[PDB]
Structures are given as C-alpha cells and as structure tokens.
Design an enzyme around this catalytic site. Structure first.
Site, PDB file in Angstrom:
ATOM      1  CD  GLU A 121      92.846 -20.992 -16.482  1.00  0.00           C
ATOM      2  OE1 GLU A 121      91.672 -20.674 -16.542  1.00  0.00           O
ATOM      3  OE2 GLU A 121      93.662 -20.760 -17.359  1.00  0.00           O
TER       4      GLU A 121
ATOM      5  CB  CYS B 173      92.103 -23.177 -19.863  1.00  0.00           C
ATOM      6  SG  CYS B 173      91.382 -24.832 -19.753  1.00  0.00           S
TER       7      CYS B 173
HETATM    8 ZN   LIG Z   1      90.852 -25.180 -17.542  1.00  0.00          ZN
END
Ligand SMILES: [Zn+2]
Length: 188
Positions: free
Chosen positions: A63, A92
């Site tokens: 990300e 995440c």
């Molecule tokens: Zn992450």
DNA sequence: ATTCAATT
C-alpha cells in the site's frame, strides 16, 4: 499485455508457489469544476517496488508504494481527481490507518480500493477494517461487472478472451461471508 | 479457501 494474468491470479489457488511479488494496478482521472475530463482511456500498472524518485524507503508494504505514486502525479488541490486501486490481498492494518488520514487531508480526491480477497493472519485487525470502510476510502469486493471492466481495461479483450468460471462465486463466498460479519456486526 | 530500500 500478458495472457489473462488477472484471471489466472483469481484461480491461482494451486499455483501458490509461495514466491510471488504483489502488483497493484492504478488509474487516474481528471475532473474540472467547470468541465469533466475522463482520462480512463489511459491506464497504468504499479508494482510493490517503491520507485527511487520517491526517496528513501518508508517501510515494507504494498500500500505504501501506491501512496508514493499519488505525490508523483502532482495533482492540483484546486482540481478534483478520481483514482482507483485494484489489489488482491487484505487491506493490512497499520497501512489501513494511513489511507484514512490521506483522505482526511484530501477529500477532493475520489479513491476506491477493490480487494479481491481478505486474509487475516490473526483475529484483531478486524477493527481496522471498520475504520477503513469509513475513512479507508470506498472498499468493495471484485464482482463480475467490475471484473469485466478490469479485464477489458487492464487486458485487451481482443485476442485475449476471458472465460467465466464458478471461481469468482467461490471467492465471493469467502469475502461475502467475512465482509458480512464485519458489516453485519455494524453496531448502531 | 488461497500465494508474497541503497551503491558503482
Ligand atoms: Zn501494509
């Protein structure tokens, strides 16, 4: 464009060799208050490798690589821009909070993240998902309608036809059940 | 249902 890799990725259940890097696809659109411009005709791909121009590494997360691209497009604060992100992994946890702050500092950008599947190593980051839905931009499960657009947009359907299988439905069953638990438990 | 940044 390489053979239907997007389609292969969904059925990659057995292909799980255990040594694959994550790749993220990004899109950019230009919106003007006086006029609207659709840059959807153009598209690009993003890898989990942070570009050198971004500077030093800030951490090891796919990300974050996407976050590095936003500042590289030098978007004008006075103009609105819609950016889409396609990923096939869980949102995440620590990064989930970072995306919420980004939108708060930039509500003029329309950001939507599609997660093909969510894998939680342990039960605890579920709370982040609830916050992610509120500030983590719009998140939805990949569907046939969106899949056809990603399939045609990311890969040229000309010469590369995608064959529909009951695989997306099986994947939807896991995401629909797991996502339903979080939204179903939406406490008033 | 699922896999896994730097220098010359
Ligand atoms: Zn992450």
């Amino acid at each position: 464009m390489d053979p239907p890799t997007f389609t292969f990725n969904f059925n990659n259940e057995p292909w799980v060799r255990g040594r694959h890097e994550t790749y993220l696809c990004y899109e950019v659109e230009r919106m003007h208050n006086d006029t609207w411009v659709l840059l959807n005709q153009r598209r690009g791909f993003l890898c989990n490798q942070a570009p050198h121009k971004h500077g030093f590494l800030e951490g090891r997360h796919a990300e974050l690589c996407f976050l590095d691209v936003i500042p590289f497009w030098k978007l004008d604060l006075d103009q609105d821009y819609r950016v889409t992100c396609f990923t096939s992994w869980s949102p995440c946890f620590s990064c989930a909070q970072e995306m919420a702050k980004f939108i708060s500092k930039n509500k003029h950008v329309s950001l939507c993240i599609f997660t093909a599947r969510i894998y939680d190593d342990q039960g605890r980051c579920q709370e982040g998902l609830r916050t992610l839905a509120e500030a983590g931009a719009k998140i939805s499960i990949m569907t046939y309608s969106e899949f056809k657009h990603c399939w045609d947009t990311f890969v040229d359907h000309q010469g590369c036809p995608f064959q529909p299988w009951d695989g997306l439905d099986e994947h939807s069953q896991d995401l629909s059940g797991r996502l339903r638990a979080i939204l179903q438990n939406q406490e008033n």
